Structure 1
Amino acid sequence: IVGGYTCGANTVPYQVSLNSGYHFCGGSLINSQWVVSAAHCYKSGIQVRLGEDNINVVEGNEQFISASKSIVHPSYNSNTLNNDIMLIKLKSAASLNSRVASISLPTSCASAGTQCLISGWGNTKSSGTSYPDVLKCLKAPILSDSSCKSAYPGQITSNMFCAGYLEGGKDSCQGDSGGPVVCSGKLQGIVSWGSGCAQKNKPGVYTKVCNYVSWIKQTIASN
């Protein structure tokens, strides 16, 4: 996260770190056995790390559960990043509580103007690289479909929305991928792509989670 702030330990209880020997993507816990992330974060050998604040230090609230299976959305296209969503099942259910909690899926799509919370352990610099050990947070508005398409012409499909600040300075970044964009307590986006991080007129682009609720529910119902 570029231009964000330190969340505070376990203040984002649904935030997940996907680790394969190292943190490589964020994710959101949506019930005791399932995590949602970006399909572009797909990897064999995922261990889900819940209850994390400093991902490099064992602090006392973590749960480390290997993934038993991953399901990349059937229509995910890696070239356009259209339908950039994936579900991960945990081999054992997580113990839910105040510090490790699931986030609700949306009943309706969010609208332009809604302020949302985006969090992750990604890069905090637009020029340079510095990866924090603790979770960073950014409050950011959903942008209109027209400003999203003006910023990235010919690239925004109906399964994507932009969120952020067209002046730059505040954005998600590499390493934040697969992580949450929560608006009014509902998971509305997944950190997916953007040109650079925090550049002027190049906001973050996010998977539009409301389009996937029936698929998430149906998939969890049979797996």
Structure 2
Amino acid sequence: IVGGYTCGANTVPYQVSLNSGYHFCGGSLINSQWVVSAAHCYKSGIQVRLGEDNINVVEGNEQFISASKSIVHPSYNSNTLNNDIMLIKLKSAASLNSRVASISLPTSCASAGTQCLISGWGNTKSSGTSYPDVLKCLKAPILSDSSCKSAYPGQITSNMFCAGYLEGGKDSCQGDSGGPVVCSGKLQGIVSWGSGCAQKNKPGVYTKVCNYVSWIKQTIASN
């Protein structure tokens, strides 16, 4: 997260870190045994880390649970990042309380202008590299389809939306991928891509979760 703020320990209780010896992506807990992330985060050998604030220090609310299966969306195209979404099942159920909690799926697609909370452990610099160790947060509005397509001609599908600031300075970034965009208490986006970070007229691009609620529910119901 570039230009954000320190969330505070366990204030984003659905935020997970995907660990394969190191944090490599975020995700969102959507029930006690399922996490949703970005398909471009896929790898074997994932351990899901819940209850994290400082990902380099054991602070006392962590749950470390290995993945039993990962399901990349059947239509994921890694070249275009269309359908950049995947589901990760936990080997055992997470224990849920105030510091570890699932985030509700949307009942509808949120509108341009809605303010959302974007969070992750990714790079905090647009020129250079500094990773924060504790969870960072950003409040940002969903942008119109027309501003999104004008920023990224030929690249925005119906499964994507932009959020952030056309002036730059505030954005998600490398290492935030797979993590949440939450608006009015519902998971509306997954951190997916962007040209650099916090650049002018290059806002963040996010997987549009509302398109995938039926796939997520039916996948969970049969796996």
C-alpha deviations, 1:2-37, integer Å up to 9, x for none? 000000000000000000000000000000000000
SS at 2:24 equivalent: strand
Q: In structure 1, what is the Cα distance between the partners aligned to 2:173 and 2:160?
A: 16
Q: In structure 2, what is the Cα distance between the partners aligned to 1:157 and 1:8?
A: 34
Q: In structure 2, what is the Cα distance between the partners aligned to 1:105 and 1:218?
A: 13
Structure 1 residue ranges, 4+ long, deviating more than 6 angstroms after superposition: none
Structure 1: gaps spanning 5 or more residues: none
Superposition deviation, residue 42 in structure 1: 0.1
Please give the TM-score of this superposition, normalised by the length of structure 1.
1.00
Superposition deviation, residue 180 in structure 1: 0.1
Q: What is the RMSD computed on CA atoms of the aligned residues? A: 0.2
In structure 1, the partner of 2:206 is 206
Q: In structure 2, what is the Cα distance between the partners aligned to 1:171 and 1:53?
A: 20
Superposition deviation, residue 171 in structure 1: 0.0
C-alpha deviations, 1:184-219, integer Å up to 9, x for none? 000000000000000000000000000000000000
C-alpha deviations, 1:41-82, integer Å up to 9, x for none? 000000000000000000000000000000000000000000
C-alpha deviations, 1:91-132, integer Å up to 9, x for none? 000000000000000000000000000000000000010000
C-alpha deviations, 1:117-174, integer Å up to 9, x for none? 0000000000010000000000000000000000000000000000000000000000
In structure 2, the partner of 1:115 is 115
Aligned length: 223
In structure 2, the partner of 1:54 is 54
